[PDB]
Amino acid sequence: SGEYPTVNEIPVGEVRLYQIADGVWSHIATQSFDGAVYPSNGLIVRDGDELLLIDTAWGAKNTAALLAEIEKQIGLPVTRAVSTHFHDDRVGGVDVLRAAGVATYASPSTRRLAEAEGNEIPTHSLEGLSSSGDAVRFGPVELFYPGAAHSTDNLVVYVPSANVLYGGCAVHELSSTSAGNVADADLAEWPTSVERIQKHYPEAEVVIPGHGLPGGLDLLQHTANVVKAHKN
Numbered sequence: 389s390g391e392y393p394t395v396n397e398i399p400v401g402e403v404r405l406y407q408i409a410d411g412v413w414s415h416i417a418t419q420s421f422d423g424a425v426y427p428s429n430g431l432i433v434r435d436g437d438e439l440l441l442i443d444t445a446w447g448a449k450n451t452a453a454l455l456a457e458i459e460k461q462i463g464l465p466v467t468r469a470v471s472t473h474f475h476d477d478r479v480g481g482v483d484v485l486r487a488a489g490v491a492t493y494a495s496p497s498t499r500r501l502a503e504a505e506g507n508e509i510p511t512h513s514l515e516g517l518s519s520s521g522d523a524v525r526f527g528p529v530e531l532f533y534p535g536a537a538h539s540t541d542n543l544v545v546y547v548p549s550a551n552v553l554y555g556g557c558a559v560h561e562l563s564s565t566s567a568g569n570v571a572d573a574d575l576a577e578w579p580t581s582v583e584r585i586q587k588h589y590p591e592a593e594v595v596i597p598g599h600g601l602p603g604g605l606d607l608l609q610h611t612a613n614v615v616k617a618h619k620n
């Protein structure tokens with residue numbers, strides 16, 4: 389009823405959308421992994437009379453439900469998708485997207501890591517993102533590679549028309565007490581990568597984490613704090 393959705397308000401197998409700004413939505417789904425249930429976010433950005441999708445809904449069936457929810461709530465076609473790193477919460481569902489006519493994209497690093505993990509593999513490679521601080525335009529967004537953080541390949545996404553920063557899994561929500569799933573992380577570099585984000589996007593108004601609730605710019609400093617306290 390208007391609050392940000394949580395696992396407790398998403399019916400089983402289902403996806404919810406949340407309006408962030410004009411022409412910007414997040415998508416929220418839930419999935420089980422190793423016997424626990426987690427929410428995850430992605431982004432939808434209006435691209436004229438088409439939509440750009442950022443990240444899958446963490447699984448094939450979730451991603452099919454995402455497409456249905458978009459059709460119901462927005463009614464514009466998803467034409468392109470970008471995955472912001474190689475984990476299944478970002479790429480699981482790419483095969484569904486690819487068979488639904490969506491062109492799927494990720495950095496070459498993400499594609500290599502996805503293939504090596506046995507995860508679904510986006511079709512198209514995004515060049516120009518291999519060095520930290522790199523940025524490229526992609527439709528209505530800017531893609532930015534901040535350096536290694538949650539993963540070596542993690543990308544963030546900025547929507548300049550709305551000053552929305554989608555941090556993905558490199559950014560955690562304010563209520564977080566832990567650095568999440570750090571199996572593939574670089575805890576030592578992560579603060580430096582967050583400082584790069586902070587320097588590059590000082591006018592961000594909304595910051596969206598990979599998992600949990602959006603907030604403001606404070607999510608960035610909080611993230612650095614939680615990662616430092618974890619590493620210690």
Ligand SMILES: CC(C)c1cccc2c(-c3ccc(CNC(=O)[C@@H](N)CO)c(F)c3)c(C(=O)O)[nH]c12
Nearest residue numbers: 421426475476477538557566567568569570598599
């Ligand atoms: C590899 C990928 C598919 C994956 C699988 C499973 C979990 C995760 C998470 C994750 C884990 C924990 C928390 C917060 N803690 C809790 O939710 C407590 N209930 C338990 O510690 C969180 F915010 C995110 C992340 C991430 O960090 O990006 N990626 C995950």
Ligand SMILES: [Zn+2]
Nearest residue numbers: 473475538557
């Ligand atoms: Zn991840």
Ligand SMILES: [Zn+2]
Nearest residue numbers: 477557598599
């Ligand atoms: Zn994640």
